[PDB]
Design a binder for this molecule. Structure first.
Ligand SMILES: *[C@@H]1O[C@H](CO)[C@@H](O[C@@H]2O[C@H](CO)[C@@H](O)[C@H](O)[C@H]2NC(C)=O)[C@H](O)[C@H]1NC(C)=O
Ligand SMILES: *[C@@H]1O[C@H](CO)[C@@H](O[C@@H]2O[C@H](CO)[C@@H](O)[C@H](O)[C@H]2NC(C)=O)[C@H](O)[C@H]1NC(C)=O
Ligand SMILES: *[C@@H]1O[C@H](CO)[C@@H](O[C@@H]2O[C@H](CO)[C@@H](O)[C@H](O)[C@H]2NC(C)=O)[C@H](O)[C@H]1NC(C)=O
Ligand SMILES: *[C@@H]1O[C@H](CO)[C@@H](O[C@@H]2O[C@H](CO)[C@@H](O)[C@H](O)[C@H]2NC(C)=O)[C@H](O)[C@H]1NC(C)=O
Ligand SMILES: *[C@@H]1O[C@H](CO)[C@@H](O)[C@H](O)[C@H]1NC(C)=O
Ligand SMILES: *[C@@H]1O[C@H](CO)[C@@H](O)[C@H](O)[C@H]1NC(C)=O
Ligand SMILES: *[C@@H]1O[C@H](CO)[C@@H](O)[C@H](O)[C@H]1NC(C)=O
Ligand SMILES: *[C@@H]1O[C@H](CO)[C@@H](O)[C@H](O)[C@H]1NC(C)=O
Ligand SMILES: *[C@@H]1O[C@H](CO)[C@@H](O)[C@H](O)[C@H]1NC(C)=O
Ligand SMILES: *[C@@H]1O[C@H](CO)[C@@H](O)[C@H](O)[C@H]1NC(C)=O
Ligand SMILES: *[C@@H]1O[C@H](CO)[C@@H](O)[C@H](O)[C@H]1NC(C)=O
Ligand SMILES: *[C@H]1O[C@H](CO)[C@@H](O)[C@H](O)[C@H]1NC(C)=O
Lengths: 216, 182, 216, 182, 182, 216, 216, 182
């Protein structure tokens, strides 16, 4: 169903707590001023345990936050002290904030659990050698895993049946920004005309492990 | 047994550019954002709109609050400014490159603030505005931003590419080269 | 034993999860390698509620953490992945880590509750004006509060008995590194011969509010 | 209202310097640190020793663990280094300054890494070694470090001071100036 | 008479092999050892587990200490090495040999250092990798080590066996022969 | 119940005391560096009297030790002098070391006193002659005693009821490595068709002596 | 009256406990047989605590010993088992051996305590640089300390009043075999024209430290 | 500096050489020894004699016991022999050398067994039998022996010396060199 996504409500800041400033890079650098806020919902076992963390930043510094496990706003730096004292004295606003863990976090999670949590995209797996430089060091066997979601993936290396443990290098999980990941897992060995290598890939979008052999 | 996830609502208002953005994030990927200019919810992936909705006016109302709060913050710190933090830039292919097979080049801009950057894609040294797209300013764990720019391209040993990024934190534009390698 | 401070026990890292590294790219900048760990005991209303947060940094990035409210290690970046899988598969180790909340946090807290938590050092308040014989804009009345502990302090200005709530600037709370704080709460006004100003400072180390009077 | 506090155990090992430190922090202040060299517990305030003790070897042990782990991390990242982060330097009086009345100059070194720095106190442009002191590398809320240096001095209209801080992240040594202004 | 016993904790760290071990010994017999690579407490006899426990991480910490101390020792002796000490080798049966009755071949490697050795079992001149087991480097009364290698076997006048040991203190691999005798 | 074996805690070594060094065994041999430590708990009648002796070895030499009956560390060679001086000047550490005789030795002894100290396995006694060739000519009668524990065992040979105290040879007590021992006690005699030989083995695992008989 | 030194009385070994040996070792190496015994008296704080440790060797291995803390003989290897059982069953003999801690160790100690224990011989300190060659203007600074007794000597290096702790290399304590020692302690520095170095030598024969100054 | 000392009585009988020795050691140095062929107590230092006495017959009686015990040990081990362990040799001066000032050359022979050696002093390449002396076989902490040979000489820039040691465990005689330098 098409359920409405709700947003966290932001509070208005008042006056007071003026500071002389600090003194950072500048002079020639162009001035800029940023009011940035992130409200993060942390889930554990779905909605079993949820923690809400709101973080306020002004330019380069986080100055205030709302940890739903604390129940009250708390200044990270002087600059945020005014808001903490102010919003903490508005019982109505606090009650509202305290409930967002359910009216916002748990609420939106439920909606996203219908398509985002269950989203799964099968990886495209390939295998091939590289580094045509038998003068630089050793020979490298690359196992390419691309275009998959979610990010949690496991790629092992097998040489003639028995798995390899050392000599493994990777570029790690690379995020593409479009809900797909990619990664290259290499094996540092010395390919022989009479050798069989395999790359095993375990991923939640695969009923059972995908394998790809390679022989010289 | 381990269903751990993170959802983030990220919003900002910036001066003097008068820019503002609002977005939702799921495990590091963007679900949607709101054009403070068009007042329209824009889904990162088309398909998402069939499973949910969001009233863009909420985002706009929220930005307005950030805009008011910004003026208070500028007064509370006597208009003192912080240095500009320059971005790191990496260009890579969206998937394994094969000659003659449609692909996408990725220009990943990371760890920078303020959230304003100029990006130019260059194919064989010439600017390209066809088949290009970009994400809005995404959140990182800290106080900085990240962003993706995309270019549809047809692999060939004949061409080469460059992503040119300009940010107030750079002495001079940053150019990252990319070309096919068998 | 309850007079001996106990240290958090650090686990040993193993092989696996090797990465291309990449980095940032200095070229001329001298190379350095830092293994940095911080174990934070967060206390809410004494030992009533405690949260243990361990954070591992390699050079400039945090790559792994152990949140006592989560119960297991969780990678923050690829680099921390091998350690989470390795340490999370060690039930004996996880059991010991989970209990450090008591064997270390609460334990050490009770020891510090005898001389740190109660520590109190009364502030020295002084008032004076600035910008005379060298400046043209607006005089300023400075209320200097130095050498106090803990950090939370409240300073208010008064003109002819009536309090001021604007034209107030501060250098904010300044930590001196030797367990004392210092600060300057300035009032922006033009002193007139027939005026009496009052700086009122409230601090937990003071039975009742302190007040310093100043006249021109 | 509520008794909220934070206790922090901070430790590290640094290469190629081969430097290590172990320390405890109470609400932002140092309780004690261990001299990896002198295998000795050093309290920030002498008076703390009357309320507790702490075995130094156990700390040298923890450091040894960080040393071993550091090697693994070097292998795991293929000795890929990060850029040095230069420090912000501030020089202020520890308390209100009155002519002829002995006070203390504070050289606050903030937001830098690695935890290594050369600090030179200067009186009338001359290096000073008498009456200077310092803390170990202290923790911040992030991954960077902070540190304090102190200089006992006699308030005069004559002399002027400079705190010179050199760090691998700085092109040229940084020098903050300070003089008296009645 | 007189309940006299010896319990020993033996640990070492070796370079440039980067090998380490931690083990307990009761009257000359291994109680258990900790696999520096598997971070697991291994009991000599499975049945010992039901009578006690040992936290493996504790042992890894001790090893880390030995690793740091090793670096210090090298600096202290100006990286001056000693001569390798070749081992004596002996092959015998675990119990009386009877055709068709299962038994165990024992390869006793004694009085050697450093604690690194390559052992190869041979049945009828051919490498055997099945039914082979081994102990860790056990302690002697002095500064040298001893080790046991095991090979399951079915006694037959048709077969002969061989334990080949290689050590940096041996010019050529040392092989010892064994075969059934009525 | 939750019996946890405790380990000895190793101290960290400092700088200083460096030496020149000389021709030990380098040259063609592969260089190696070994930091070896053995901590021995010697027990006399259980926990009545216990002696702790820790020995430090660098490569092939013992350079330092800690004898509980002495109370402090003592260099065995120059190379261990620095550590002797450093560690003995650390009262906190010394005290900890001096107590390990109780916190470690006696502690672990009580854990092991339940399954190791009382462990008993009964020997398998067998008797047979060796050296035949053809028509047969034996000059050695072998009493084989195997698979037993503890090692203290007593073997005697008897001929027609009368014992033998000459011509006895043995392979000695042989440790198998898996908590069992074996041994061959041989008797030199020329077996005559009309003779009766007996092997009597005494072992703590046997309520009464075991005897095997052998006639030609 | 001239004190007479008493010797430890050695026992006669008996038969039994014969062993096969181990086969063959070298072969081409000349055969030899050594019966070696060392009776060591260990003193702690003079005669306050005395420990007798007799050790028996046959060729290259200790096989038996008598620790006065144990009160009886104990085999170290099977080759000594026969002796242990033999001498341990002779009450008169054990009594005697147990008494030698008094009739031999303490007795002789009181005799050597008149000239050996108090023996003192003043070191002869000298300073000088090294390493000239063709291209070299500054290097090591050799502090030579020779002809002294006993062995516990402490050498320290000073540079313009302040003391050096780094760059110190030494030959350690060298025993001449004639009841005197010698050692070289060198400082790794760069001798400048304007520079004052000094070597401080502490030793039980010197009422107060001895120093030798050196300048370029 | 607790009065910690060691006193050792060391004795042996060696075959087939039929050599026997008895000595006393104090903290590593010989007090005296008895010549088994001369039945005389020889003091390491002449002066020792006025402070103590020792009946040589007590040592000869002890050697006699070692002599009988040796045969028993030979039988007990079926006359099995162990390898010969070669010595380590170092040549040095007793004290700092000065041209024209009487001195002494020390030939330190360490870690060897059996206890028999042939030491030859060589000046300019020719044997030297005048002004030479030696110790008997001194005990070490282990099972091996040590010994010192001595040569009185007059330092000169023209001569060079060599201490040639031959032991059954040496393939060829071992020759250490020594010449002036200062
Ligand atoms: C990024 O490009 C924009 C152009 O859209 C630059 O902004 C313009 O700058 C000029 C001169 O500085 C102004 O006259 C325009 O009004 C600006 N336009 C806008 C929309 O801001 C900007 O300078 C570039 N950023 C950087 C870092 O160079
Ligand atoms: C900070 O001071 C240290 C010490 O003076 C400098 O590092 C030393 O530099 C010299 C020569 O460059 C080396 O021989 C030493 O080994 C270095 N370490 C030490 C501990 O002395 C360092 O270069 C200075 N500069 C900075 C930015 O730290
Ligand atoms: C024992 O076996 C090991 C394993 O093959 C040998 O060590 C390797 O030797 C090769 C070739 O010299 C090196 O490339 C490896 O780096 C070594 N290490 C390992 C873990 O294999 C060793 O040389 C063999 N010989 C002895 C005497 O140990
Ligand atoms: C060391 O010197 C001894 C004796 O000078 C040599 O042994 C002698 O060898 C001859 C014949 O080879 C025998 O007749 C003697 O009986 C031996 N001993 C003695 C005391 O005369 C020995 O060969 C020399 N070399 C070595 C390595 O010991
Ligand atoms: C605020 O900033 C201005 C410059 O923009 C500066 O002149 C003034 O001193 C600052 N105010 C204070 C209280 O520091
Ligand atoms: C590791 O660093 C070296 C440079 O020292 C580089 O040549 C090599 O390619 C790096 N390894 C990987 C997997 O990137
Ligand atoms: C904890 O807080 C509650 C109220 O929040 C208070 O009543 C209680 O006394 C506190 N506990 C302690 C030990 O102070
Ligand atoms: C998640 O659920 C599991 C049981 O399924 C539990 O063991 C674990 O502690 C839960 N995590 C949190 C953060 O509650
Ligand atoms: C230390 O060892 C090195 C071998 O790398 C040698 O060149 C040097 O001379 C030695 N120096 C000392 C003081 O032992
Ligand atoms: C004893 O040694 C001899 C050689 O000297 C050998 O032939 C014989 O087999 C050995 N006897 C025993 C019982 O080991
Ligand atoms: C030597 O005497 C002191 C004080 O009389 C004592 O503490 C020490 O233990 C004694 N030495 C020994 C080895 O007991
Ligand atoms: C050990 O045996 C002795 C017999 O001398 C007895 O006195 C003592 O109580 C026993 N000790 C233990 C711990 O069993």
């Amino acid at each position: 169903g098409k359920k409405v996504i709700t947003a966290f409500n932001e509070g208005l800041k008042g006056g007071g707590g003026s500071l002389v400033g600090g003194g950072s890079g500048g002079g020639g650098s162009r001035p800029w001023f940023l009011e940035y806020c992130k409200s993060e919902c942390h889930f554990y076992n779905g909605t079993q345990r949820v923690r809400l963390l709101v973080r306020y930043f002004y330019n380069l510094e986080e100055n205030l936050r709302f940890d739903s496990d604390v129940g009250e706003f708390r200044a990270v730096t002087e600059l945020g002290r005014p808001d903490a004292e102010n919003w903490n004295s508005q019982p109505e606003f606090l009650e509202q904030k305290r409930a967002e863990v359910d009216t916002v976090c748990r609420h939106n999670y439920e909606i996203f659990d219908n398509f985002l949590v269950p989203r799964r995209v099968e990886p495209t797996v390939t295998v091939y050698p590289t580094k045509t430089q038998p003068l630089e060091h050793h020979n490298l066997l690359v196992c390419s895993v691309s275009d998959f979601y979610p990010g949690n993936i496991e790629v092992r290396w097998f040489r003639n049946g028995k798995e390899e443990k050392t000599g493994i290098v990777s570029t790690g999980l690379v995020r593409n920004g479009d809900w797909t990941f990619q990664t290259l897992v290499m094996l540092e060995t010395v390919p022989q005309s009479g050798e069989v290598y395999t790359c095993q890939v375990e991923h939640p979008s695969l009923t059972d492990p995908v394998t790809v052999e390679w022989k010289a | 047994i381990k269903e751990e996830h993170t959802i983030i609502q990220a919003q900002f208002y910036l001066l003097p550019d008068k820019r503002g953005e609002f977005m939702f994030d799921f495990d590091g990927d963007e679900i949607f954002h709101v054009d403070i200019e068009k007042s329209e919810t824009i889904w990162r992936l088309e398909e998402f709109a069939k499973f949910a909705s969001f009233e863009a006016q909420g985002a706009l109302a929220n930005i307005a609050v950030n805009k008011a709060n910004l003026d208070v913050m500028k007064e509370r710190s006597n208009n003192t400014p912080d240095a500009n933090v320059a971005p790191e830039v990496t260009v890579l292919s969206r998937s394994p490159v094969n000659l003659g097979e449609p692909n996408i080049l990725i220009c990943f801009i990371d760890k920078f603030s303020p959230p304003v950057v100029n990006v130019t894609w260059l194919r064989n040294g010439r600017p390209v505005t066809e088949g290009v797209s970009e994400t809005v300013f995404l959140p990182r764990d800290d106080h900085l931003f990240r962003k993706f720019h995309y270019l549809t391209f047809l692999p060939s040993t004949d061409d080469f590419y460059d992503c040119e990024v300009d940010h107030w934190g750079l002495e001079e534009p940053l150019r990252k080269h990319w070309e096919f390698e068998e």
